[PDB]
From Swiss-Prot:
It comes from the Bacteria. It catalyses: methylarsonous acid + AH2 + O2 = arsenite + methanol + A + H(+); roxarsone (III) + AH2 + O2 = 4-hydroxy-3-nitrocyclohexa-2,5-dien-1-one + arsenite + A + H(+); nitarsone (III) + AH2 + O2 = 4-nitrocyclohexa-2,5-dien-1-one + arsenite + A + H(+); 4-aminophenylarsonous acid + AH2 + O2 = 4-aminocyclohexa-2,5-dien-1-one + arsenite + A. This is Trivalent organoarsenical cleaving enzyme. Its cofactor is Fe(2+). Fe(2+) binds at Q5, H62, E105. It comes from Thermomonospora curvata (strain ATCC 19995 / DSM 43183 / JCM 3096 / KCTC 9072 / NBRC 15933 / NCIMB 10081 / Henssen B9).
């Protein structure tokens, strides 16, 4: 089991927290200056809002797949490299980039 992560760079974190609390009917799980996390049950989603100074509009920061443990990250890392994709792991996460530049990370919290 896993869930997608969607990390957005937003020009107004406070307004965005308010909007997403209403959209998904739940408050943020974690709130800091500069970022907020929502753990949504349905639809399964990890939503990250990152404050972006002098971005005129919301844009994609990165995308992800949130998995249950480090072994799942390792499995994904091995699989993506096998399939010919350039990757970088961190010691848990592995990063790949799509052809138009969109970055993905498979990670465990």
């Amino acid at each position: 089991m896993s869930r997608v992560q969607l990390a957005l760079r937003v020009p107004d974190l406070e307004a965005s927290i308010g909007f997403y609390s209403k959209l998904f009917g739940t408050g943020p799980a974690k709130v800091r200056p500069g970022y907020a996390n929502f753990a949504i049950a349905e639809p399964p989603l990890k939503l990250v809002l990152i404050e972006g100074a002098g971005e005129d509009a919301t844009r994609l920061d990165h995308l992800g797949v949130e998995v249950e443990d480090s072994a799942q990250v390792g499995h994904a890392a091995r699989r993506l490299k096998e399939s010919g994709l350039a990757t970088v792991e961190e010691n848990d996460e592995v990063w790949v980039t799509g052809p138009g530049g969109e970055p993905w990370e498979v990670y465990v919290v």
